[PDB]
Amino acid sequence: DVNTLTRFVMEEGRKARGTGELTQLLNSLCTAVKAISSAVRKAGIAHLYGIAGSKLDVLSNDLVMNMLKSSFATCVLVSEEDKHAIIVEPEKRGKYVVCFDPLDGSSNIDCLVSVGTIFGIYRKKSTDEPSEKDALQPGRNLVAAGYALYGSATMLVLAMDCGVNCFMLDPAIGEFILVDKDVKIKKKGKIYSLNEGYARDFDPAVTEYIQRKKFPPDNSAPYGARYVGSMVADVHRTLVYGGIFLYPANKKSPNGKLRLLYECNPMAYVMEKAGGMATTGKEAVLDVIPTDIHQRAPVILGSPDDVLEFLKVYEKHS
Amino acid sequence: DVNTLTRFVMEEGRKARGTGELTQLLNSLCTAVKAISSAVRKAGIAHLYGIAGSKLDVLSNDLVMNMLKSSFATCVLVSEEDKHAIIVEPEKRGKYVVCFDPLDGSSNIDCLVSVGTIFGIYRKKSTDEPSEKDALQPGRNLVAAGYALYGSATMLVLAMDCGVNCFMLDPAIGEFILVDKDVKIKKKGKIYSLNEGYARDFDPAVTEYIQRKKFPPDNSAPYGARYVGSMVADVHRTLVYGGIFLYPANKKSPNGKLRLLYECNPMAYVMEKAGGMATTGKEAVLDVIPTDIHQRAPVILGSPDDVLEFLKVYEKHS
Amino acid sequence: DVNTLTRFVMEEGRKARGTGELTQLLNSLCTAVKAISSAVRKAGIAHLYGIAGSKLDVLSNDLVMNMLKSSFATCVLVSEEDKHAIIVEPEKRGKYVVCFDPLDGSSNIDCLVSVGTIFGIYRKKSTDEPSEKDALQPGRNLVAAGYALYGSATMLVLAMDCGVNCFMLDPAIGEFILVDKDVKIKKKGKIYSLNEGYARDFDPAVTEYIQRKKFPPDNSAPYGARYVGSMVADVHRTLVYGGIFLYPANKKSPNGKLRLLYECNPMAYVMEKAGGMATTGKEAVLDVIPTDIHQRAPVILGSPDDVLEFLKVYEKHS
Amino acid sequence: DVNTLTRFVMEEGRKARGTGELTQLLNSLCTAVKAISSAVRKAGIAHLYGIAGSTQVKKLDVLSNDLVMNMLKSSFATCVLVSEEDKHAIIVEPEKRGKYVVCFDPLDGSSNIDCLVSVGTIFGIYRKKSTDEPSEKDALQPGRNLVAAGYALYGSATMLVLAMDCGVNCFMLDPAIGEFILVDKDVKIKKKGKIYSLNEGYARDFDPAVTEYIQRKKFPPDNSAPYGARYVGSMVADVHRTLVYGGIFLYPANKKSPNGKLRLLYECNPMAYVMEKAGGMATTGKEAVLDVIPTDIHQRAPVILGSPDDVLEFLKVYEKHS
Ligand SMILES: COc1ccc(S(=O)(=O)NC(=O)c2cc3c(-c4cccc(NC(C)=O)c4)ccc([N+](=O)[O-])c3[nH]2)cc1
Ligand SMILES: COc1ccc(S(=O)(=O)NC(=O)c2cc3c(-c4cccc(NC(C)=O)c4)ccc([N+](=O)[O-])c3[nH]2)cc1
Ligand SMILES: COc1ccc(S(=O)(=O)NC(=O)c2cc3c(-c4cccc(NC(C)=O)c4)ccc([N+](=O)[O-])c3[nH]2)cc1
Ligand SMILES: COc1ccc(S(=O)(=O)NC(=O)c2cc3c(-c4cccc(NC(C)=O)c4)ccc([N+](=O)[O-])c3[nH]2)cc1
Ligand SMILES: O=P(O)(O)OC[C@H]1O[C@](O)(COP(=O)(O)O)[C@@H](O)[C@@H]1O
Ligand SMILES: O=P(O)(O)OC[C@H]1O[C@](O)(COP(=O)(O)O)[C@@H](O)[C@@H]1O
Ligand SMILES: O=P(O)(O)OC[C@H]1O[C@](O)(COP(=O)(O)O)[C@@H](O)[C@@H]1O
Ligand SMILES: O=P(O)(O)OC[C@H]1O[C@](O)(COP(=O)(O)O)[C@@H](O)[C@@H]1O
């Protein structure tokens, strides 16, 4: 029996006897994602090249912002693309706070690398007039989170309390189809993913863990290496195949590079609902209390056996 | 003044007062590429999931296999998917021999990684009846070669004598728009790309070259690392951004993993026409005389300064 | 401030404090309509004609049937294609009865004429086992009705107690965009639409009315004539421009050609919700109490002044 | 064996050892038709209604004119272009000139496109017969001189119908891959149909031959079945139905439209040419449409076309009343 993201979230919502706002929100997100995919896939590029006579970052941000605002389900919107939190105008305010990265990985989108949209959804916890402060919530408080991946196909991965579900965008009918239900990550994987160009500034624990993957001391096959350079692609692979992903801290970068509110946390939430783990090396990513909406956080995520092994090496150096 | 693949190839052919076969071939290949892109982007997957009540490898092969047969421009077809060369039926025989990987990278299609269609086109040399022998020419003898990348967008990259030109698929109108003319690769890059999971197996030249990239003995910034794990993706980025790509040999894969006929030679050709290089370490990829349509080869290709640097390391250890 | 059919419908549902089934029903129908639109525009047709080597009646009807069964919102499904009402199996049953024409007008689709999907939705309030007799209801009992027209573009027209709203299918993102709110028909129009090839068989009141259009007796401008031959096209033009559409009785169809349950009633309901009218000559279309799910009715609909003019002529003869 | 428009027109050019200009022209047009089709089907309409806030917006009939004009210019194959939209024939800039003269209606029927009526693009292609600088006069040729002609139909599906001396061929647009698939080869029209098409609102102003012929279609004198009526109001749709089911389509001369309404150069001629190559007929009542020597690029003409027996039957009535 065929299932869409809309049918799926409606049935979850009416079982919880909710007000409808979260379903309104995810439909808006879904619509924005579909438009982003059309633009990423370069539909109508011919017109820009003069076919009739006479920004992807920004257009993606513009779609997520406007679609989310017009949902009447949000009050505060934090985007990688905006210096300050966007306060929804009063007559459109709903009860959710969304943090998102509209087109993650676009830094190298000139080579047609996979990119994605990342989102995490919170309840406003206070009745104060809405402010930046409403996004300064730990990942533990997440209500929903996930990502759209613009890869060889476009897929939305959606994480809630009910688990992780994968919807494939059928572009012929603009409908997100349920194709993988209540997904769970391998307890131990065989791929490791991190940018080894930074090896000279590696934290010595990172160096030892990576060297244990390439030169294991126990009969075992060395892990394979993958590193797309686009987080949504690398994390999604980690979830499908298992294994470990790392953007760790070092001495030039005490807090890693990736941003906690709209990269690290949603991915950490997907991982943990998938039975995986996500650490900074000092604590669970979902346990960090943010003080700045654009703050960075180290992230080591993926299969639990692998993340656990990394923390074993990490502690050995602390 | 807008240009398309069909227009570009017709004009080069009209200028060469040709027979029109290569243009029938490249236009048929374009049709097959667009059907692949639609299918890879999940065209109508909702029918497969029961929307009306009621293999990506195989279909892509069938689309290229049939469209080329149907061009009347080919007589021998070699595909990764087929054990032996396809001999076109006499009624449809043309003068060209085509070696292709129909959906390269698809072993990891489950995580929606970038995939691609790699192709290389030869003129039949022998006057014998057509056979597998006709595909055993050195890459030097290539008339045309290139790839279609199914990434964030679908792009066709075609290399001929005139150079390497890049065409974006506008899926809104199904047309390959010329977006980069007469492309040339950077003289020296800032990215290296190889599966370092086989580090335990690297010969000393690769180990030293890779050490040079993470710990440059000269002041400089270390290279960044990218390994998508799909050759079309990794090579295109190399082309677009510069740098070096490597699949050296290892314990499994003593002759290297990638395929000479329909993976290495097309990419080496694209690269050489772009000002780049492509070596096996011992010789240029295009000088290897094949003996078996599916034989493997080591490959180091990319920006010329980076490949020359690798070869100086190779010599030091030779 | 953009708005979608999905967003519009659940916002009407939230306000009504309803059970959700109507939204699940209409969202499922929307999916069917998007799949039909794609097939109607012949996407994937090249696969039929050999692109890779190796019925719109039936296919559209399968799409509506399964999408409606899948919604859990219907219990009795009457369609043009099926001799009997389809009873939904117990575990998928909802409270709604849907009568539809899955691909109205398709008899002449070999000529690429406009076609569409007509639907009408009644509630069942028996507590008896659902049965075909639950579809024998006057149009007055319609909960919702409308149509999807596959014209130069695809539009869904949806009518409820809150009025008529018009949604454009954006094929780039597979979304139904609200483009015309709370629409109302022109008080009087300038187009009359019917098959004049039945002139030898018209009742004299039909004959007199047509003559008034061609030789206006108040010395106004003659009406223009338009007959696409496809009910959805002809009715939609009537809704947008005003005027009158007629399929009266003739020798081959002594009580009309078009079907009361899933052709006349939905169109009649849409007309009355846009401030137009729909009569059989003797009574309001919506007032007919049917005794057979496939029974036919004469229909005259359009702008109220035009229908009243026909009725003044009809009454002069009865 | 699968055949696209590009492949079918290419192999025709190889057979005749041509310069490639006509193929570059039709490929140009095919690109324009595909862009028009995507816009007609409201491709990115949601941006117009603000899914991304405030950031073409032309009116489709204007977009289509730009699309056809630009593509044809860029084909390097045309010297004089005539459009319904521009009062004067466009002279292609010299750098871009080729041998063909093209007359087209970029989005015919678009007046009612707000009701999502079927619409279409019409074209006819001539060679330049003059030796002078290209001028408007170069498009004042009789339909007889047409090299190729046809139309795109933006109906429930998009289809390009292409007529040349080799006959009439129908190519269905596959929007999934942007390819025109040859689906009906060497089409021919039924010798006699069962549908008549014309705007009967103008009955009061009809010529008496039209009145009689139409009354014959409704009240036949020989116990034949009366014809059915269809009239989309959109020439491309009506003429295509005529090509596929047979029958007759009429926009005839009026008391108040002494020269009909449809434009000779880029509406009647291409439809007349498509009919003639498909085994049918196309008359003004007083001559074959294609024989009319035009003196104005925007002059109009009566046009009766369709099944040969039906047009003939009509002319008998026309000769009786003359
Ligand atoms: C765990 O996953 C979640 C996803 C979404 C949401 S929610 O906040 O967005 N709620 C909805 O979506 C939603 C609720 C609802 C109801 C419904 C039924 C009984 C009680 C109430 N509620 C009161 C009396 O207060 C409502 C009926 C029909 C539809 N329907 O089919 O549209 C509904 N949809 C929450 C959780
Ligand atoms: C470097 O790039 C290439 C790509 C393709 C090819 S080729 O082998 O496929 N030939 C073609 O493409 C091609 C040729 C050609 C001609 C043409 C003109 C004068 C002489 C001849 N020939 C004889 C007298 O024998 C032909 C006219 C119109 C078109 N046209 O616009 O369709 C043409 N297309 C070669 C090289
Ligand atoms: C006139 O137009 C219509 C269109 C649709 C419908 S309905 O019957 O299918 N209802 C729905 O769709 C729908 C209801 C609903 C609720 C909701 C809220 C308070 C009470 C209840 N109900 C109980 C306690 O019993 C439900 C909350 C959120 C969403 N939401 O935004 O998903 C909802 N959607 C009716 C009429
Ligand atoms: C009946 O319908 C028509 C449709 C199209 C045309 S044409 O004028 O546009 N010619 C073409 O299209 C076209 C020609 C051509 C040739 C070719 C071959 C031998 C000689 C010459 N010519 C010289 C020596 O002068 C050319 C080779 C390859 C391709 N090819 O497959 O690319 C070609 N395409 C005319 C009529
Ligand atoms: O180049 P690096 O330092 O390896 O970083 C790659 C990381 O940066 C990101 O591209 C974030 O950068 P963007 O601003 O382009 O979104 C992540 O997707 C990815 O994980
Ligand atoms: O898994 P590895 O050892 O890194 O090898 C990856 C290589 O294998 C390939 O995927 C071969 O392609 P396939 O997926 O078609 O087998 C190349 O694209 C890629 O460069
Ligand atoms: O050809 P006629 O007798 O004028 O009737 C046309 C009517 O028939 C219909 O096409 C219904 O028939 P089909 O659905 O079988 O094609 C209506 O859409 C249209 O109004
Ligand atoms: O409404 P009328 O007078 O019957 O004329 C309709 C005719 O006019 C046209 O619409 C002319 O097209 P335009 O919409 O571009 O004016 C033809 O397509 C059609 O045959």
PDB file of C-alpha atoms in Angstrom, chain B residues 1-2 4 6-7 10-11 14 19-21 23-24 27-28 30-31 34-36 38 66-67 70-72 92 171-175, chain D residues 1-2 4 6-7 10-11 14 19-20 23-24 27-28 30-31 34-35 38 43 70-71 73-76 96 175-179:
ATOM      1  CA  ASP B   1      24.294  33.112 -28.541  1.00  0.00           C
ATOM      2  CA  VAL B   2      22.782  29.862 -27.228  1.00  0.00           C
ATOM      3  CA  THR B   4      23.339  22.959 -27.904  1.00  0.00           C
ATOM      4  CA  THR B   6      23.279  18.816 -31.366  1.00  0.00           C
ATOM      5  CA  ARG B   7      24.198  22.147 -32.959  1.00  0.00           C
ATOM      6  CA  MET B  10      26.571  19.212 -36.549  1.00  0.00           C
ATOM      7  CA  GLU B  11      28.698  22.292 -37.199  1.00  0.00           C
ATOM      8  CA  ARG B  14      29.539  20.085 -41.527  1.00  0.00           C
ATOM      9  CA  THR B  19      29.271  11.375 -43.658  1.00  0.00           C
ATOM     10  CA  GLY B  20      27.042  12.269 -40.680  1.00  0.00           C
ATOM     11  CA  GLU B  21      27.607   9.024 -38.758  1.00  0.00           C
ATOM     12  CA  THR B  23      26.549  12.958 -35.340  1.00  0.00           C
ATOM     13  CA  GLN B  24      23.885  10.266 -35.535  1.00  0.00           C
ATOM     14  CA  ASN B  27      22.661  12.391 -30.960  1.00  0.00           C
ATOM     15  CA  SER B  28      21.501   8.844 -30.204  1.00  0.00           C
ATOM     16  CA  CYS B  30      22.162  12.010 -26.030  1.00  0.00           C
ATOM     17  CA  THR B  31      18.713  10.474 -26.197  1.00  0.00           C
ATOM     18  CA  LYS B  34      18.347  11.696 -21.105  1.00  0.00           C
ATOM     19  CA  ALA B  35      16.343   8.517 -20.571  1.00  0.00           C
ATOM     20  CA  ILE B  36      18.996   7.405 -18.078  1.00  0.00           C
ATOM     21  CA  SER B  38      15.015  10.545 -15.956  1.00  0.00           C
ATOM     22  CA  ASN B  66      19.756   0.022 -28.287  1.00  0.00           C
ATOM     23  CA  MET B  67      20.117   3.715 -29.125  1.00  0.00           C
ATOM     24  CA  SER B  70      19.702   2.267 -33.814  1.00  0.00           C
ATOM     25  CA  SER B  71      22.039   5.057 -34.989  1.00  0.00           C
ATOM     26  CA  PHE B  72      23.366   3.020 -37.961  1.00  0.00           C
ATOM     27  CA  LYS B  92      22.534  -1.525 -39.014  1.00  0.00           C
ATOM     28  CA  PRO B 171      15.348  18.702 -18.030  1.00  0.00           C
ATOM     29  CA  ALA B 172      12.516  21.232 -18.471  1.00  0.00           C
ATOM     30  CA  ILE B 173      12.998  21.042 -22.247  1.00  0.00           C
ATOM     31  CA  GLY B 174      15.320  18.050 -22.641  1.00  0.00           C
ATOM     32  CA  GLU B 175      18.232  19.844 -24.274  1.00  0.00           C
TER      33      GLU B 175
ATOM     34  CA  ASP D   1      13.091   1.003 -34.657  1.00  0.00           C
ATOM     35  CA  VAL D   2      12.761   4.311 -32.766  1.00  0.00           C
ATOM     36  CA  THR D   4      13.064  11.119 -33.599  1.00  0.00           C
ATOM     37  CA  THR D   6      15.990  15.168 -35.669  1.00  0.00           C
ATOM     38  CA  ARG D   7      16.975  11.718 -36.952  1.00  0.00           C
ATOM     39  CA  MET D  10      18.760  14.415 -40.788  1.00  0.00           C
ATOM     40  CA  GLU D  11      18.536  11.284 -42.932  1.00  0.00           C
ATOM     41  CA  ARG D  14      21.792  13.087 -46.252  1.00  0.00           C
ATOM     42  CA  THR D  19      23.847  22.131 -46.704  1.00  0.00           C
ATOM     43  CA  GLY D  20      22.318  21.283 -43.306  1.00  0.00           C
ATOM     44  CA  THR D  23      17.898  20.634 -40.393  1.00  0.00           C
ATOM     45  CA  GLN D  24      19.416  23.364 -38.232  1.00  0.00           C
ATOM     46  CA  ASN D  27      16.086  21.633 -34.747  1.00  0.00           C
ATOM     47  CA  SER D  28      15.922  25.316 -33.821  1.00  0.00           C
ATOM     48  CA  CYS D  30      12.003  21.970 -32.119  1.00  0.00           C
ATOM     49  CA  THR D  31      13.888  23.640 -29.286  1.00  0.00           C
ATOM     50  CA  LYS D  34       9.754  22.434 -26.384  1.00  0.00           C
ATOM     51  CA  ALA D  35      10.329  25.645 -24.456  1.00  0.00           C
ATOM     52  CA  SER D  38       6.926  23.716 -20.998  1.00  0.00           C
ATOM     53  CA  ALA D  43       6.180  24.815 -15.729  1.00  0.00           C
ATOM     54  CA  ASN D  70      15.461  33.840 -31.299  1.00  0.00           C
ATOM     55  CA  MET D  71      15.839  30.156 -32.175  1.00  0.00           C
ATOM     56  CA  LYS D  73      17.746  33.631 -35.876  1.00  0.00           C
ATOM     57  CA  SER D  74      20.281  31.400 -34.073  1.00  0.00           C
ATOM     58  CA  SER D  75      19.886  28.531 -36.598  1.00  0.00           C
ATOM     59  CA  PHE D  76      21.995  30.510 -39.116  1.00  0.00           C
ATOM     60  CA  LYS D  96      23.366  35.106 -39.107  1.00  0.00           C
ATOM     61  CA  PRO D 175       8.496  15.548 -21.965  1.00  0.00           C
ATOM     62  CA  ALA D 176      10.465  13.078 -19.798  1.00  0.00           C
ATOM     63  CA  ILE D 177      13.395  13.165 -22.245  1.00  0.00           C
ATOM     64  CA  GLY D 178      12.558  16.178 -24.397  1.00  0.00           C
ATOM     65  CA  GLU D 179      12.425  14.155 -27.604  1.00  0.00           C
TER      66      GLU D 179
END
